[PDB]
């Protein structure tokens, strides 16, 4: 709420452009996975070509999945901790481990 709203408008616009173009007609459940070559989560964004190894592909996929789930839980905790404290995360953490 403190930052200018035009910044949010432009950020949301850029994300809207990115995900409108990243799947040109592949929205909805019945149209996205019509091609039996689009594996889920593969938007083609691998510039550095980590995914041309094929031995660490499975461990990288599991690392991404587990880190994503952990980040979901973590961000939920951070948001609700800020809600119940009114302070940022590490200030609240310092107030937890204060003294008494």
């Amino acid at each position: 709420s403190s930052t200018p709203p035009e910044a949010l408008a432009q950020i949301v616009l850029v994300l809207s452009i990115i995900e409108f173009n990243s799947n040109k007609d592949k929205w909805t459940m019945d149209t996205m996975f019509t091609d039996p070559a689009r594996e889920p989560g593969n938007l083609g964004f691998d510039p550095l070509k980590f995914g041309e190894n094929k031995e660490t592909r499975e461990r990288l996929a599991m690392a991404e999945l587990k880190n994503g789930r952990l980040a979901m839980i973590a961000f939920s905790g951070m948001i609700h901790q800020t809600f119940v404290t009114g302070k940022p995360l590490f200030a609240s953490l310092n107030d937890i481990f204060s003294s008494p």
């Binding site: 550095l48 980590f50 190894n53 990288l60």
Partner: protein, 188 residues
């Protein structure tokens, strides 16, 4: 594993891979890593040289800089990093344009790309105009390449130290240091 170049007499004939950061990727990602390392090394060498030429000695270019805003090279006479956010407004853009042209031509006009079977770090012409990398033997060229790698690693550690010296309390246990912003003022 990499096993290509950069293992000097400091860790001793062996690759420095604690976390690895290799073998989790393909062969082209290693070449991309080496290209990024060499570009970082050269950029931080130039940044150490610029920090030395700005912070203490200050051998400013003779004349004016902006002609419109009245910005003088002598007027840029304080701070290592606040001097960047005083070089007009189009002056930054005409440097970033040169850098962008150089790198788009380095990635396009070099016929074998480094992620396809080429070499990370090549030259259209801009490197060695005077022939300082002349008839010297390939063992001498390998020695100078190793010296470049080690000097660049030291230069990256050097610019990392001189940035976060007056901003992170002690950190670097030395007495001197300059006060400025840690990172620059968001490009242009």
């Amino acid at each position: 594993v990499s096993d290509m170049e950069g293992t000097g007499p400091e860790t001793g004939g062996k690759v420095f891979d604690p976390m690895g950061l290799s073998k989790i990727a393909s062969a082209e990602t290693l070449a991309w890593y080496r290209a990024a390392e060499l570009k970082h090394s050269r950029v931080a060498m130039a940044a150490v040289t610029g920090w030395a030429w700005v912070s203490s000695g200050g051998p400013l270019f003779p004349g004016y800089l902006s002609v419109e805003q009245g910005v003088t090279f002598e007027s840029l006479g304080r701070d290592g990093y606040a001097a960047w956010a005083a070089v007009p407004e189009a002056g930054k853009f005409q440097i970033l344009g040169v850098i962008g042209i150089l790198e788009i031509l380095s990635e396009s006009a070099v016929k074998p790309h480094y992620m396809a079977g080429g070499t990370p770090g090549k030259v259209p012409l801009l490197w060695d105009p005077l022939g300082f990398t002349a008839k010297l033997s390939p063992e001498t060229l390998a020695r100078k390449r190793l010296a470049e790698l080690k000097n660049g690693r030291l230069a990256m550690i050097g610019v990392m130290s001189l940035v976060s010296a007056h901003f992170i309390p002690n950190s670097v246990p030395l007495l001197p240091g300059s006060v400025x912003x840690x990172x620059x003022x968001x490009x242009x």
